[PDB]
Amino acid sequence: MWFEILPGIAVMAACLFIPGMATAHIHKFTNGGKEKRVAHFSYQWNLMERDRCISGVNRYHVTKGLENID
């Protein structure tokens, strides 16, 4: 009967699965764990620019905390 559609849809299922999968992980790879900080408004953007300038390595995704001040 119909269980033969599953091989037909499974390929598309896996094929449709990669984009969301790929975006999920390389964002972690590019941004080091945390997601790419979304900037829907000016505030989140200049928050990011302050982070990038304060990192010193010129990378927002690198975060420095209480250890950074003495």
Partner 1 sequence: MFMINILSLIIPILLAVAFLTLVERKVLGYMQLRKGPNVVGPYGLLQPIADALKLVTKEPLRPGTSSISMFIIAPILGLSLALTMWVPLPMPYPLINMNLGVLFMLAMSSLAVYSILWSGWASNSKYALIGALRAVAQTISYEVTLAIILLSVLLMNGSYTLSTLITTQEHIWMIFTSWPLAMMWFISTLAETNRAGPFAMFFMAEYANIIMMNAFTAILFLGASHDPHTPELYTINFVLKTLALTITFLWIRASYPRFRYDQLMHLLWKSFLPLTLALCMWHISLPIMTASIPPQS
Radius of gyration of the chain (CA): 20
65 binds, among partner 1, ligand CDL, none (CB under 5 to 8 A by kind): none
Sign of CA dihedral 48, 29, 57, 67: positive
Give the phi and the psi of residue 40 in degrees, each rounded to 5: -85, -10
Measured from the CB atom, is 7 or 19 closer to ligand CDL?
Answer: 7
Q: Is 68 in the site for partner 1 (CB under 8 A)?
A: no
The binding site for partner 1 (CB under 8 A) comprises 1-2, 4-5, 7-9, 11-24, 26-27, 29-30, 35-36, 38, 40-41
